[PDB]
Amino acid sequence: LEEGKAGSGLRQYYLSKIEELQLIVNDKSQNLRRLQAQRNELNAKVRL
Amino acid sequence: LDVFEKTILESNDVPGMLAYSLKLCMSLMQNKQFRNKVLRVLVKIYMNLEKPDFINVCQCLIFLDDPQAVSDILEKLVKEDNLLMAYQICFDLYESASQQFLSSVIQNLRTDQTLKMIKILSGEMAIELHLQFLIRNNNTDLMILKNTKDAVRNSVCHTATVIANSFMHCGTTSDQFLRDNLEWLARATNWAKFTATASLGVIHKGHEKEALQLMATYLPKDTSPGSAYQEGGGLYALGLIHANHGGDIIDYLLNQLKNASNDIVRHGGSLGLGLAAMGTARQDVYDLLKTNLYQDDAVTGEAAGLALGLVMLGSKNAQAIEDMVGYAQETQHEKILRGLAVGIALVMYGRMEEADALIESLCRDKDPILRRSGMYTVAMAYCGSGNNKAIRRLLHVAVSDVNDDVRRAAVESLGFILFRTPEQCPSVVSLLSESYNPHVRYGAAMALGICCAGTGNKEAINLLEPMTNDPVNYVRQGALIASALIMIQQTEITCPKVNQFRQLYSKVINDKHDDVMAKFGAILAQGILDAGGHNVTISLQSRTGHTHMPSVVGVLVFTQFWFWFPLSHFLSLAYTPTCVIGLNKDLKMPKVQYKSNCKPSTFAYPTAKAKKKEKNPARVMPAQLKVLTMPETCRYQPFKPLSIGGIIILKDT
Amino acid sequence: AVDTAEQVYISSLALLKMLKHGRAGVPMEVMGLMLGEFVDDYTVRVIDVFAMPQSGTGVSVEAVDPVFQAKMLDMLKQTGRPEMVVGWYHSHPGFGCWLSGVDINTQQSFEALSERAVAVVVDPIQSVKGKVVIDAFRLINANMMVLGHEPRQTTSNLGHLNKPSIQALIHGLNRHYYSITINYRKNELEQKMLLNLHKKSWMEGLTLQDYVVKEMLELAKNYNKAVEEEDKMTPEQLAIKNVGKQDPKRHLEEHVDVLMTSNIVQCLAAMLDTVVFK
Amino acid sequence: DLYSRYKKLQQELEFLEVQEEYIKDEQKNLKKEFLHAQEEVKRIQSIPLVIGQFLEAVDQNTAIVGSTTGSNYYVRILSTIDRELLKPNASVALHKHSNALV
Numbered sequence A: 001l002e003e004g005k006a007g008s009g010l011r012q013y014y015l016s017k018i019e020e021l022q023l024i025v026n027d028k029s030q031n032l033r034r035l036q037a038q039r040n041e042l043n044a045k046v047r048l
Numbered sequence B: 001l002d003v004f005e006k007t008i009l010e011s012n013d014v015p016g017m018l019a020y021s022l023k024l025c026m027s028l029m030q031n032k033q034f035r036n037k038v039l040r041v042l043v044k045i046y047m048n049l050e051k052p053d054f055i056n057v058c059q060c061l062i063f064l065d066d067p068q069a070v071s072d073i074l075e076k077l078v079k080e081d082n083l084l085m086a087y088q089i090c091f092d093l094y095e096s097a098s099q100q101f102l103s104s105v106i107q108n109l110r111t112d113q114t115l116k117m118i119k120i121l122s123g124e125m126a127i128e129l130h131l132q133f134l135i136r137n138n139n140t141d142l143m144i145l146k147n148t149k150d151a152v153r154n155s156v157c158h159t160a161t162v163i164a165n166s167f168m169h170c171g172t173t174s175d176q177f178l179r180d181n182l183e184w185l186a187r188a189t190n191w192a193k194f195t196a197t198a199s200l201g202v203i204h205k206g207h208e209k210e211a212l213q214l215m216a217t218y219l220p221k222d223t224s225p226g227s228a229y230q231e232g233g234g235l236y237a238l239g240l241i242h243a244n245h246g247g248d249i250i251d252y253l254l255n256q257l258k259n260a261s262n263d264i265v266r267h268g269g270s271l272g273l274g275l276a277a278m279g280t281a282r283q284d285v286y287d288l289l290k291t292n293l294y295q296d297d298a299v300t301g302e303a304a305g306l307a308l309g310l311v312m313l314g315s316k317n318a319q320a321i322e323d324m325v326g327y328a329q330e331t332q333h334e335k336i337l338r339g340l341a342v343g344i345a346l347v348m349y350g351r352m353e354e355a356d357a358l359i360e361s362l363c364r365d366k367d368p369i370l371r372r373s374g375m376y377t378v379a380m381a382y383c384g385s386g387n388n389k390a391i392r393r394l395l396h397v398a399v400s401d402v403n404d405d406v407r408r409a410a411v412e413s414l415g416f417i418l419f420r421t422p423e424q425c426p427s428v429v430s431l432l433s434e435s436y437n438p439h440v441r442y443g444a445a446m447a448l449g450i451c452c453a454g455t456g457n458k459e460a461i462n463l464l465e466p467m468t469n470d471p472v473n474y475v476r477q478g479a480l481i482a483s484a485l486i487m488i489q490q491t492e493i494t495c496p497k498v499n500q501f502r503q504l505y506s507k508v509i510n511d512k513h514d515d516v517m518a519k520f521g522a523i524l525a526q527g528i529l530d531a532g533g534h535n536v537t538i539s540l541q542s543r544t545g546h547t548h549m550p551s552v553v554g555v556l557v558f559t560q561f562w563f564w565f566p567l568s569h570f571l572s573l574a575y576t577p578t579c580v581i582g583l584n585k586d587l588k589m590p591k592v593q594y595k596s597n598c599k600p601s602t603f604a605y606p607t608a609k610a611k612k613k614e615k616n617p618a619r620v621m622p623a624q625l626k627v628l629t630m631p632e633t634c635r636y637q638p639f640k641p642l643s644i645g646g647i648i649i650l651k652d653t
Numbered sequence C: 001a002v003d004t005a006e007q008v009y010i011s012s013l014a015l016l017k018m019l020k021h022g023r024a025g026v027p028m029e030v031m032g033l034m035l036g037e038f039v040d041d042y043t044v045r046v047i048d049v050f051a052m053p054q055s056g057t058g059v060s061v062e063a064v065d066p067v068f069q070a071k072m073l074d075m076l077k078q079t080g081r082p083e084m085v086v087g088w089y090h091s092h093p094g095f096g097c098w099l100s101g102v103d104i105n106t107q108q109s110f111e112a113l114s115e116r117a118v119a120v121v122v123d124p125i126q127s128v129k130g131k132v133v134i135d136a137f138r139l140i141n142a143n144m145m146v147l148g149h150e151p152r153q154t155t156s157n158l159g160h161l162n163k164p165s166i167q168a169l170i171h172g173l174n175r176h177y178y179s180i181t182i183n184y185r186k187n188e189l190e191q192k193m194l195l196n197l198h199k200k201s202w203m204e205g206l207t208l209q210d211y212v213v214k215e216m217l218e219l220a221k222n223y224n225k226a227v228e229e230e231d232k233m234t235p236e237q238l239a240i241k242n243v244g245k246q247d248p249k250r251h252l253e254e255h256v257d258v259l260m261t262s263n264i265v266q267c268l269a270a271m272l273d274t275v276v277f278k
Numbered sequence D: 001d002l003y004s005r006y007k008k009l010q011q012e013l014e015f016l017e018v019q020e021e022y023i024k025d026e027q028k029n030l031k032k033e034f035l036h037a038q039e040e041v042k043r044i045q046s047i048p049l050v051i052g053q054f055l056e057a058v059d060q061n062t063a064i065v066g067s068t069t070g071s072n073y074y075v076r077i078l079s080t081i082d083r084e085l086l087k088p089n090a091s092v093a094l095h096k097h098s099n100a101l102v
């Protein structure tokens, strides 16, 4: 292919590098989603 | 598009590489600008290729929406004189193309093969073939229906059972709960008897012939019953049957609008005429809908707005919204604002750009209902796309806004737009499930209910498990309907939670200590699972690719029926027939039996080889379409490869 | 026969004399009258509320003077809008604002006069700013016990108002009564200036006016230092060591974030040197 | 085919990229709403109050307190300080109607 299946992997590498980068940013969001739901449940605790 | 022409013209094969790429490109393409430009040059090289392929013209028919191009392709098929090969695009143009495109193609084509095209676009023969499918595959169970009947609750029971049996009784036209108890239906009053003549049109949906003379007992003009709300549902009853395609009943509605009941006739009358003219872009219906908008009455305001978005759907009428949103400021009622909220929302669909001009006005305004209008408007406009510009303001109104009802309708728009990729909804709506206010959780549960209804995803069932455990009563009810949409047509062999939820629906309703509110959606969750006798499903994503208008309009009106009870009886819009057909051609019914690898456990409605019709047709699950193989020993064998459902051609050897 | 759940449209002008005339009777209970227009069965509006003489001997049905209303309606004719009377209201500051024994005796009298005669109660005590409080009710006829006793259609506007269910004795009056939904028809014209008049008067009076130096920081350093050791002994208390003491315990708050904002107060107030001057 | 998915995979990439401002804008609002909820609990009960005598701490989130009139009252404690100022026997202020421990 030479355009190509060797280059497209490097193209797919960029996405997977950003996907892992996004997963790192997502991992930064995922544990931060807990800090919300926690305080969101604590926002229900003051209402409890 | 230059080098693309060389890539599609490359030698050898590439047998299907042009076929599935259009399915892949449609999903990954952000800008539709040059998308169809790639498609229009692709369908040309299909015809230039030696082997004709009719699945390519199916895709460009809806996307290019050119009435002059669709007229010339069949005009050649008329000269080609073979009705077998054109029989695929005959019903494909029917089930796929909307009412606006059907009215344009029917005119240029009809100007044998001329009589054959009449019933395909009007759906005449298409109703009866699936009318005979229902009565066969339908398996009635009266046990659970009686288990919810003996609660003996004076209210909320009259609305619950008549809408629950209409689920499993879809299209069978039979009369059962009317004949068995006369006195119990007489106990109903106010808007409850509105459903008796309404749910009568549900079970009778389809069957375009007898729908006139059978309901003559409920005629508002001649009978004039003591309760005025009983005679107001006769107009809305036939609108169900007459959704999309119309008929002679257009005069039947004209006779009952000018006599007897006023203005509650305009309630069921405009919804009956508006749903019948839905997609047709009719004029005279818009004329009498403006004076119904100015009647100033709050209850009739819903009928004026809801019927106006129907008829003008896809047309994008300028004067419609101008008279609607122009009346929204000085009106004193919320219900006129509601029907108008969906009214301006129903007219704008799938544009992705033009509708954004109104979206800026809706959400920015301080009217609580008009902010709900922006969410139903941005949903239908963005329906079928994952655009990141809509989710921006979607969360901002779902959080920063003080009103809880608009936060609900805000998260409900995620199920309308994202149904193409339902896997994304459980992730984005996850964090919204911990909201302290149950109003958001009611819509959060619905977002997984409406979007994932067709899918068999078990994760949505897992997320809906704590939803019915929440102390709030209506979030439990919202969890019952949503968890009933995920299991449609799916039995215990699919997911183990089936029998767990089925016993819970009858449990809570037979328990008097539980709230009457939540237990209304209990038996209704049964019926949702039993809808059409488990025969028919509801799918917004199909090979056709178009959204399903009556189910969305019906379920969005059924979101909150606590403002007006007819909105609970307007759930009758969610009832639609669907099936597959093995008919070869014309009126001749072939005898064909082919094997299936799935057990009767899926066929049970509370292996080596199976037996399927042989057109009445036989049932199939969307998951069972891949495991079935066309019979090699039959005299009648299909010329087209059989993969997904729908009516396909069958060639005689 | 046909009964639909009613929606009450209250005007921001009618909301005034509800709490204001109720405040004048505090602690004792007052007796008012609601003024509005009946549009239809399922909706109702109260466009005005006026004050009635408070009863120091206790509320009675004779506390309302008929010549007080006859002289008032005549003064409403020369006033912009002469709208017909609708119903009554009464304050109950001393308790959770529930219908008393006199309130039911004045029901059948007022519901004979006017069709609905919505019973409206209000209390000052339950909150100050961010709660609707107040109350409302409508008598469901006890003679209807022979007929269906569970109105209304279009339920949850009641059902949701049936939340929280407000303890026992309140909903103990749900026998022979049913409450009514209160929503606000938009006054936002007035409501926009209601926010502007409130916040501008609360923003430094000109925004200018408001815009113990080292000593306030010498008093703050006692909170920024002498409080540190009682705060920073707790991590040495988190060291057990190790481990016989019940854990976890989090002493991080609230002093840490207070001293943070304490600098935020002192830094931007010291910026007044750089901000105001030049 | 590999460029196909290569044009597919950046969707959920960018779909989660807009999901970054999704939560971050949502959580800060709710944070300010939670800070607004801090003013709520501090608003209650404001004034007036009544003196009462603490008896013993029976369990978490609630404790019994004798009223000045002598009648012992079992009251949910305030969620702020559950421990250090509790003490076995002390005079604690209570609200008029609710007799809330503050």
Ligand SMILES: [Zn+2]
Pocket: C029, C059, C090, C100, C102, C103
């Ligand atoms: Zn009183």
